[PDB]
């Protein structure tokens, strides 16, 4: 059960993500980015964008197939809900949002500490496929710092692009609207 899983992750977060230090905070980004890379290596995505948003929200966008939304056999819930309510990133985020572009439709769900706040809802239409995940790390868990280091993200994003040639991976810092930094990596 999903609620018992959320309890277990939040009780011993370091056993899942290594630590709750600044290292563990950045690990949240890598968990999400690794899923986008998996989708690229499977043959379905080639562009990943990581944005550090105002108040240290992280937004990760990919142009994969979109996390499936079909009503699943096990849970009787949309697949995306099942997948995200078992995500360690969701459990350790005070807030998380997903937008799935799939079936020419945009689907949205939001969560707090892993708990869905409402049922998956159709919010719009689209001519693309892919997934947007936005999350705010839980300061109750990450007690040292919740502020991302641009250089730390940049170094690993550049490395990921070099290791997975053909994937365009972009990093953008929007925390200061007057001074926005972007680096874009695409190895050939
Ligand atoms: N593309 C993608 N990104 C994801 C993030 C969390 C769970 C599944 C995912 N699939
Ligand atoms: Mg994964």
UniProtKB/Swiss-Prot annotation:
Location of the protein in the cell: Cytoplasm
Subunit relationships: Heterotetramer, composed of two GyrA and two GyrB chains. In the heterotetramer, GyrA contains the active site tyrosine that forms a transient covalent intermediate with DNA, while GyrB binds cofactors and catalyzes ATP hydrolysis.
Summary of the function given for this chain in its UniProt record: A type II topoisomerase that negatively supercoils closed circular double-stranded (ds) DNA in an ATP-dependent manner to modulate DNA topology and maintain chromosomes in an underwound state. Negative supercoiling favors strand separation, and DNA replication, transcription, recombination and repair, all of which involve strand separation. Also able to catalyze the interconversion of other topological isomers of dsDNA rings, including catenanes and knotted rings. Type II topoisomerases break and join 2 DNA strands simultaneously in an ATP-dependent manner.
Family membership noted in the UniProt record: Belongs to the type II topoisomerase GyrB family.
Additional free-text comment from the UniProt record: Few gyrases are as efficient as E.coli at forming negative supercoils. Not all organisms have 2 type II topoisomerases; in organisms with a single type II topoisomerase this enzyme also has to decatenate newly replicated chromosomes.
Name by which UniProt lists this protein: DNA gyrase subunit B
Organism: Staphylococcus aureus
Full-length numbering of the shown residues: 20 to 230 of 644
């Amino acid at each position: 059960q999903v609620l018992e899983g959320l309890e277990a992750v939040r009780k011993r977060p370091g056993m899942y993500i290594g630590s709750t230090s600044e290292r563990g905070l950045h690990h949240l980004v890598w968990e999400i980015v690794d899923n986008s890379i998996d989708e690229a290596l499977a043959g379905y995505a080639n562009q990943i964008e990581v944005v550090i948003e105002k108040d240290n929200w992280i937004k990760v966008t990919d142009n994969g197939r979109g996390i499936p939304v079909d009503i699943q056999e096990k849970m009787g819930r949309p697949a995306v809900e099942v997948i995200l309510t078992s995500s360690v990133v969701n459990a350790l985020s005070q807030d998380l949002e997903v937008y799935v572009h799939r079936n020419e439709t945009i689907y949205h769900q939001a969560y707090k500490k892993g708990v869905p706040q409402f049922d998956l809802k159709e919010v719009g239409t689209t001519d693309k496929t892919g997934t947007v995940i936005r999350f705010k790390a839980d300061g109750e868990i990450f007690t040292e710092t919740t502020v991302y280091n641009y250089e730390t993200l940049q170094q690993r994003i550049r490395e990921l692009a070099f290791l997975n040639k053909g994937i365009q991976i972009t990093l953008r810092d929007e925390r200061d609207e007057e001074n926005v930094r972007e680096d874009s990596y695409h190895y050939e």
